[PDB]
Structure formats: C-alpha cells, structure tokens
C-alpha cells in the first residue's frame, strides 16, 4: 500500500498537526471519534485510506501520527479536546520543563530520556506498515524543543531508516517579525539537521502568510489557525497523489527525482494559488491559466523572498479538480514566454506536471472558498539565499559579543560548535550562488 508517517515536534508542529488531521478527517469522511458511517452505508470502497489511517476490527481508524513535545500544556489540549478519541493514547509527553528556546536542552540534556520511547513508537508504527514511503516531520526553526529534538530524531531515523524519504514542513524566522530573542542561534544551529538528514525541506514564513491573509482573504486580524489551515491545505495537495485517482499521479520519489538537481540544494519554496474569500470567489473565472499565473506572482510566495532576484531551476505543479492537460500545457507555454520568469539554461525541460481528480475540500468555519480547480506549486529557486542571508547577519550581530552564549554552553555545548554551524551555512549560500551561474 502507499503509507506515510507524520511526526509533529513542538507546539508549532502540534498545532499544524491539529489542522492537518482536521483536514484529513473532513476529506475521508471520518468522524472525530474515529468511525466512518460511509462504509456502513455503502459497504464498499476504500475510504479508509492507508496513506494516513489504520483500520481495526471494530471499524475504528487510528491515524499514523506521533505527537512529541516537552511541554504537557499543548498536547493536553488534544487529549481533552474534540479529537481526544481519534488518537492512540501514546501521545509521548515529557513530564518535565521545556527546552526553553535552548537548542542544547532540546538536543542532549533533556531531549534524552524521551527519544528512546519516540523511536520505539515509530518502530511500532512502521512494523504495521507494508509499503512505507516516507516521513512527514513537522517542526519549527527558532524554537528550542523543535530544533533540538528534530535534530536528534532525524539523526536517529537516518541511522535506522536511511533509505526512506524524510520531508520537512518547517517555519523559518521572518525578516523583522519574531517572538524570541535567541531565535537566530537556534535557526543557525538547525542547519546541520536540515542539511545532512533531510531529503526535501519545505520552508514557510509567518510574515508572508500574514500578508496573504490580509490581501487575498481580507482577514485583517488572522491568528495561527489560518496559517495552520493554509499549511494543511498545501500538505494535502502534496500528498493527494497517493490517495485519489488522477490522469497524471506524482509519487514522493517522483518529487525527489524531479525537483532537486544536486543533493545539497533540496530547499524548495511552496505556494497555493486559489487563496480567495467567499465574497471574492464570485467575479472571478479561476481558470487554469489564471491560477498558474498567480503562482508566479512574487506577492503570493509564502517566504519573504523575491523570485525576480533569482533563477528558477525546477518547478512542479500539482493540479486538483476539473483540470485537463491541454489547459496545463497552454499555461506552461504562456509562462515560458514571459521574461521576468527566468530559468537556468541547463534545465530546458523546466516543469513537472501532475493532475488529480479530487477537488479541494472546504473546512467548516474556515475562510477559503469552494473552488472547482486548485493548484499547488513547488519551486526550487536561488532567491531563497536572500531569506538566509538576512538571518545570517542577525547571528553575527549577537555572536560578536557572545550574547546569550552561557545558557547554551551550560548544557553540554562547545562554543566553537556555533562557528562550525555558521561555516556550514555559509557553504550553502555559495553552493546556491554556484548553480545559478550561466554555463560556459
């Protein structure tokens, strides 16, 4: 079967997982308490899709997920919330303090004594799996528990499951908006884990999603619920190829084969085109060409970077709903003529295309309108280097005076390791600047 395991680390991961599992349960017709009346009414089909759920003899469906965090305060909301009966009781809470925005704490002084249990639960989930394809690790840069425990967990998973894919859906610090003082240290220290052990790291920015919510959706005071719902929509669009039928399906291995030219540049941007309110859902055709053009607009990107300041090297478009390949080919032909959208000379093919028949689903109480057609773009571009460089500057401004360093070295961290991470990160920037140069 086609089966993927989701892992949520930290508060950001837990809340994004709440949104994601709300979306999946709405998609597959599973009630919050795990039952599905559809199978009893029909007596056929395969709506208990193995991509995310496991069936028991009583008709109850258990999600293939593991929630991890050192704070008990965010998981206990789930354990006493609406979905308390959906998940297995093994929610893996560490009954201690948080990593407290310290990478060292989350990594190797309190992240231990729970990593063994987490790996045991992951092994238990994988043993029930027959055709396990990859992992979907949700976390967030900048935080302590997220960065540190993700580093430890990905290292152990690469040791144990070195062949399987490992996708990341992480949140990157914004240029100006941030909710922590020591955030750049954790974000820079996360470079080793997001480089060596990750196979394809998707990054999003809070400022960009706030701008999208303000402009497109006309929500002037959005909260984290809207951000989590948008990220859930993108993840569902990525993963839909393994569940529903389609004219052209795209597996995870196909993503990894088409999007990354070289091993070290697996950091693509992601975006979602038909983000529009119900009021503005009218007055708009929302054809294939319009959404395909809306993908390339610099204002709709979910990371505060300018694609116009770089060169595209690999694009992948996943269409959902009433989409025919003729319109997609016409849209690609229209795109290739525009001069603002510059492609590297060494990738003349350009685009990967996938189409799926299942349209998007509207979450009740949400903000996205019902749309017959939708598309999700993944794009490998050099402009992401800009989104790194600014953060790099911030790190220097705090490392010149060794500010906040004593907290990290008080938990089994060598000071020089900071520099080591910085050095590695610098190489990444140069590597990106190496690939965008025109051939000779």
């Amino acid at each position: 079967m086609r089966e993927c395991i989701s892992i949520h680390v930290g508060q950001a991961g837990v809340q994004i997982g709440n949104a994601c599992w709300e979306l999946y349960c709405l998609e597959h017709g599973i009630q919050p308490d795990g039952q599905m009346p559809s199978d009893k009414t029909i007596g056929g089909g395969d709506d208990s899709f193995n991509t995310f759920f496991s069936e028991t003899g009583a008709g109850k469906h258990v999600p293939r997920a593991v929630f991890v965090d050192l704070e008990p305060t965010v998981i206990d909301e789930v354990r006493t919330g609406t979905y308390r009966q959906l998940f297995h009781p093994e929610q893996l809470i560490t009954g201690k303090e948080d990593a407290a925005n310290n990478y060292a704490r989350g990594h190797y002084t309190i992240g231990k004594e729970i990593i063994d249990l987490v790996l045991d639960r992951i092994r238990k989930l994988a043993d029930q799996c027959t055709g396990l394809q990859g992992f979907l690790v949700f976390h967030s840069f900048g935080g302590g528990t997220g960065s540190g425990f993700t580093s430890l967990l990905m290292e152990r998973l690469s040791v144990d499951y070195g062949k399987k894919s490992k996708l990341e859906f992480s949140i990157y610090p914004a240029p100006q908006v941030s909710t922590a003082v020591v955030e750049p240290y954790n974000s820079i220290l996360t470079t080793h884990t997001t480089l060596e052990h990750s196979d394809c790291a998707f990054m999003v920015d809070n400022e960009a999603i706030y701008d999208i919510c303000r402009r497109n959706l006309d929500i002037e005071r959005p909260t984290y619920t809207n951000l989590n719902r948008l990220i859930s929509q993108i993840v569902s669009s990525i993963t839909a190829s393994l569940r529903f039928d389609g004219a052209l399906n795209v597996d995870l291995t196909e993503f990894q084969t088409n999007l990354v030219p070289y091993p070290r540049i697996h950091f693509p941007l992601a975006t979602y085109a038909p983000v529009i309110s119900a009021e503005k859902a009218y007055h708009e055709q929302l054809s294939v060409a319009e959404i395909t053009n809306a993908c390339f607009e610099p204002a709709n990107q979910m990371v505060k970077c300018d694609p116009r300041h770089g060169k595209y090297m690999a694009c992948c478009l996943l269409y959902r709903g009433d989409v025919v390949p003729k319109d997609v080919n016409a849209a690609i032909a229209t795109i290739k003529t525009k001069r603002s959208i510059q492609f590297v000379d060494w990738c003349p093919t350009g685009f990967k295309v996938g189409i799926n028949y299942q349209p998007p689903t509207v979450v009740p109480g949400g903000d996205l309108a019902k749309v017959q057609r939708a598309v999700c773009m993944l794009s490998n571009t050099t402009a992401i280097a800009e989104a790194w460089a600014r953060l790099d500057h911030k790190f220097d401004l705090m490392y010149a005076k060794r500010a906040f360093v004593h907290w990290y070295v008080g938990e089994g961290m060598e000071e020089g390791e900071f520099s080591e991470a910085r050095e590695d990160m610098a190489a990444l920037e140069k590597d990106y600047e190496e690939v965008g140069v025109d051939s000779v």
């Binding site: 002084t109 231990k112 360093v405 004593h406 070295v409 008080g410 938990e411 089994g412 020089g416 520099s419």
Partner: protein, 357 residues
Amino acid sequence: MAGASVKVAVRVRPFNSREMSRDSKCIIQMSGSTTTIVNPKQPKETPKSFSFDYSYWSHTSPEDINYASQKQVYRDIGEEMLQHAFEGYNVCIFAYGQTGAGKSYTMMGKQEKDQQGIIPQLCEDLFSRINDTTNDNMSYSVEVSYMEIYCERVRDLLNPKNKGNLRVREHPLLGPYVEDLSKLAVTSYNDIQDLMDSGNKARTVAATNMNETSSRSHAVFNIIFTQKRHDAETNITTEKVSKISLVDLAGSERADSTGAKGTRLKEGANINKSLTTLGKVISALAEMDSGPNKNKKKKKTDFIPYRDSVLTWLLRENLGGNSRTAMVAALSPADINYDETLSTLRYADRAKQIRCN
C-alpha cells in the same frame, strides 16, 4: 592600566605507542605561524587553517629541521615571562588541552630531567638568579600556594584537612584573595616539585567515557616573589612584590561524550562556563592591549568581565593592569581524536585572532 599582551602557542606531540602500533595518520600541518587541520572523514574537501603567535612541531623526536624543543619553548615564553616577573609585575601562564594530549609534558616535562617543562626550568632560573644577585644588601623571598576551583568553589590541596569550601574576599587595597589558604616558604625547586606532587595527589578527578581519571577541576600554583633592597639609606623597605601563576585548565566536555546524569553533567557545565568566561576575559585583554599600544589614547576605562567566574576573579590582579599573559595548547596528531583536537584549536582561535592569508 598598562595593558597585558597575550601570546598564543600551539604544540603537537609525537604518536604514543598504541597509536604508533596502529596504522594511524597525521592530520596536522604547520608553516611558520599557520596551522592547518585536515578532516579524515572527508579528506578531499579542504583543511581548515588557523593562525596563532607560535606553532610548535614537536612531532618527530629525532628531527633536525624546525623542531620545537622544550628549551626553545622556554626561551620563547618562560624566559621572557620570568624576566618580566623580575621587574616587579604580575605573570600568569595557562595550560589547555584534552586528556591524552600534552599539558603535563608542556608544564612539567619528563622525569629524567634531560628535557623539562616550563615549571621546573622557570623555578631553576629563578633560584639561580636569586643566588647570583643576592649581595649583602639584597634579600629575596619566595612563597608558594596551590589551590583548585571546582564548581566555582575554592579548595586547598596542600593542607590535608576536611575539604571545605574556602571563602573569597576582596581586600580594598590588595584586590581579591582567598581566606585561610596555606602558604609555605621554599628553598629549592625540589621543594616546589614536592609540594606540587602532594597537591596533585589531592586534586579532584573522576571517571568518564573519555578517560578513567579525567580532571574535574581547575588548579593554580601561585608563586609570590618578594624583593627587599637594603640600600645606603635610613629607610629600608620591600621594593617590589610580584606574583607568578601557573594555571591547569581542564579540557572542554560535550554532553554526548559523557552521558551520565547528575554530578558529571553539572561538572561539565561548570567547566564549560568557566572556560568561556576565561576566553572572553583573555580576548578582551588582548584587544585592549593591542589598541593603546599603537593608538596611545586611553578610551575611558573600557570594561572586562572580572566577576563572571572565580577563576577570572581571583586572577584579576594578574590578568591585566600591568602584566603579561601566555597560553599553551596541546594537540594530538592522530586522526582518531580529530574532532577533539579541532575543539582545542577553536579555543586557541580566541585571544586576538590572527587573520592573515
């Protein structure tokens, strides 16, 4: 406020018997004042290059060209520093490095007394000069103390009582000092060696995954030197008072290296904190010495984190004002210890990092 220049020295030891028997490889190269290290895991990427004041290739014992003999190391560091101490100004030498590296060789040297460390050679020169210059008017006095710092608590090694935590006070005129610390007079370098051996017997050590008796505490040997001149005058007074400190810094420690919880983790955290504070204070001192020496403009009073650790606090008089500093870092040459050596090199990068190349 005269400033204190700091000299950074690195030295490489030969292969031990176990490493010599095994097919180990050298990873360290030296050219003038530049030292480069090559990763064995991916040798094809690049060697990381660093710059220090002195780089010492003591790798091959019978080598004829560019061998940093112990007498050479003395002549660069200990001779000049002893001469500075003779003028009446404070002195402090530091030793850093991981276990299995040098340290003991650099400071003490071999027991056969054919090749000696900085400590016994410095003591011999001190006492020979004392016997040479002691006329009817001169009077030279030497005293020694030896203490340890462990979780920011001071303990005495010479005195065999119950090892309580001694109290640290601040004389308004004489600066920081330790209350109820044993101080003894000495008449030869043999007495110095005896007291140092007795103190080293009493230091705090513990068993970890890196060594069975890894050091768990810093230790300092203060040599107090006093000069009295009975000149042809009606008022004879102690002309000058100077101190010489020899510091044995315990090496850095990582969490994964020592998985034990409780005491060992707290010891490692305290050692790491003291080490970063010492790095900061030495780097600030190096920068402040460099600036005025060329500009000769005293910018207000600057600042320096004296009160961040007991080690930097008690060495406040020696570290800065008017003194000299120097640190020697020991390096293993075997690929097997590569990461460890790199960490040592990184700590040597502080103290007015040289850029060059």
